[PDB]
Design a protein around this ligand. Structure first.
Ligand SMILES: O=C(N[C@@H](CO)C(=O)O)c1cccc(O)c1O
Ligand SMILES: O=C(N[C@@H](CO)C(=O)O)c1cccc(O)c1O
Ligand SMILES: [Cl-]
Ligand SMILES: [Cl-]
Ligand SMILES: [Fe+3]
Length: 294
């Protein structure tokens, strides 16, 4: 049997329980692994080191997103390619390489070009989960994930008091970058989901994966009630000299006098978030936000 899968580009016929799947979407690897889906190839350098697919010698390695070996996709001859986040720019190239595969694009827009990044994130993760449940005959598991996600969102919304200000940062290489409202990496769309009041707004905000450049003193002058921290380098397997984000924040002099540090109102996203921006990661993050903000 087959199913008609609608993505941002159109609708494509996908075999149910397809063969020789290539998966390229950081947001859905953990779902596929939890469901026991066999994969033919994945881009191992962009994935969490602990992923079972990374550790499996029988899963071929497409390589990094900067320098991929897309020819392996043709050699695998897949029935399905799952494109997402870091491989979105290769969607047209992949369709040309494997014109007989169903190629689905599960990248949704959380960039500065999105007018609704919060809804794109929430509906995008739900849509990706539902589509994969249809393709892999995991509809009950997909429904449960979506229901758990909706409930986690509701609890984290209820926990936020509506007045505390929020500073969101990406720590990389010892630097504290700004994750701007709306478009900031990981945290940006969450401002829209939860209605967080920003501690700081800057000109020229972007989606820079390292955050936008801001001085520590500018962050400190905004005196946030909360600092929410993405540890970029902790998630990346090839970054072996990494300084944990907790150490960077704890020893940043200008931040010490902020209300956030003074009250211990700092939340760190899970270690693998940067390479695993998935429902499963956000169930953990939203549970921790709900506990902290209450
Ligand atoms: O090496 C990475 N990026 C380099 C190119 O932007 C860098 O110099 O940081 C890198 C690795 C895994 C995953 C990433 O999103 C990533 O940006
Ligand atoms: O395309 C990506 N990175 C390249 C362009 O900025 C790069 O040069 O690393 C890319 C896409 C989504 C998410 C990322 O962290 C990422 O590094
Ligand atoms: Cl089709
Ligand atoms: Cl901003
Ligand atoms: Fe990146």
């Amino acid at each position: 049997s087959t199913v008609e899968i609608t993505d941002v580009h159109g609708t494509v016929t996908v075999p149910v329980n397809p063969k020789n799947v290539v998966a390229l979407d950081n947001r859905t690897f953990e779902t596929l692994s939890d469901w026991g889906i066999e994969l033919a190839a994945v881009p191992k350098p962009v994935m969490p080191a602990d992923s079972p697919y990374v550790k499996d010698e029988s899963v071929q390695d497409i390589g990094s997103h900067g320098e991929p070996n897309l020819e392996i996709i043709a050699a695998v001859d897949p029935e399905l390619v799952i494109v997402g986040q870091r491989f979105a720019r290769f969607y047209d190239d992949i369709k040309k390489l494997v014109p007989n595969a169903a190629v689905i694009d599960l990248n949704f827009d959380v960039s500065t070009e999105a007018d609704a990044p919060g809804e794109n994130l929430v509906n995008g993760l739900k849509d990706s989960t539902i589509a994969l449940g249809q393709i892999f005959d995991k509809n009950k598991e997909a429904e449960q994930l979506v229901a758990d996600f909706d409930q986690a969102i509701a609890e984290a919304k209820s926990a936020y008091n509506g007045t505390d200000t929020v500073m969101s940062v990406v720590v990389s290489g010892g630097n504290i970058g700004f994750s701007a409202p709306h478009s900031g990496r990981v945290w940006g769309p969450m401002y829209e989901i939860f209605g967080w009041t920003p501690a700081l707004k800057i000109d020229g905000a972007s989606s820079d994966h390292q955050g936008d450049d801001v001085s520590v003193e500018a962050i400190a002058q905004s005196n946030p009630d909360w600092i929410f921290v993405l540890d970029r380098d902790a998630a990346v397997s090839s970054m072996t000299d990494a300084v944990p984000a907790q150490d960077v924040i704890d020893k940043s002099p200008a931040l010490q006098k902020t209300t956030a540090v003074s009250k211990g109102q700092i939340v760190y996203a899970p270690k693998d978030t940067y390479t695993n921006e998935s429902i499963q990661t956000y169930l953990e993050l939203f549970e921790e936000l709900a506990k902290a903000l209450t």
